[PDB]
Design a protein around this nucleic acid. Structure first.
Ligand code: MG
Ligand code: MG
Ligand code: MG
Ligand code: MG
Length: 127
RNA sequence: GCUCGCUGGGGAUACUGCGGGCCUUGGGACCGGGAGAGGCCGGGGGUACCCCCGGGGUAGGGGUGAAAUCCUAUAAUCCCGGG
């Protein structure tokens, strides 16, 4: 019939991770991060690295019989920043261009209802 | 005039003081329908985060203006089921 999977995208200011699993999430199909396609630590969160990683993951998934994916994109969340980095949209676009169909798209960033205390003291980073 | 201070008598009753009588406006008591993260005690929850166990996967993760220390083949980061 139709084999559909899930693409988990983890986007921060330092890196990007693209992880394709099956429909239930318990079996991993492919997994690629920004540090596996570039040489400079400064280029890990760039959109171009996201495109490269997404292309590699999409090819590996396509060779195994996956047809389309639903997308779940997240920032670090918690007591860290709630906003996704610059590589999320580039990752989303590259998956479609590689040949996979796209289902529904939603963000699953974990948000606290007044949880724990963040780092930096009561004055924050002083730079 | 000064020693602005003392003392024997007579007169007045507006104000202050003292005694008596009569009030309700200030203050207090009580009744009615409502408002509020005011306080104390008991019970039930919400996501988030950390650690441990089991399944998948394999070479990086993290962090900076740029790096390094640090974590990772005793299988990390990431995903799933539980405590
Ligand atoms: Mg890296
Ligand atoms: Mg410190
Ligand atoms: Mg300075
Ligand atoms: Mg395991």
């Amino acid at each position: 019939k139709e084999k559909w999977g899930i693409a988990h995208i983890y986007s921060s200011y330092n890196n990007t991770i693209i992880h394709i699993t099956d429909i239930t999430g318990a079996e991993t199909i492919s997994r690629w991060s920004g540090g596996m396609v570039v040489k400079a630590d400064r280029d890990e969160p760039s959109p171009y690295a996201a495109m490269l990683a997404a292309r590699r993951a999409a090819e590996e998934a396509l060779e195994k019989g996956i047809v389309g994916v639903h997308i779940r994109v997240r920032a670090p969340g918690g007591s860290k920043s709630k906003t996704p980095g610059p590589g999320a949209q580039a990752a989303i676009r590259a998956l479609a261009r590689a040949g996979l169909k796209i289902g529904r798209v939603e963000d699953v960033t974990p948000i606290p209802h007044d949880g724990t205390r963040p780092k930096g003291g009561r004055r924050g980073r002083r730079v």
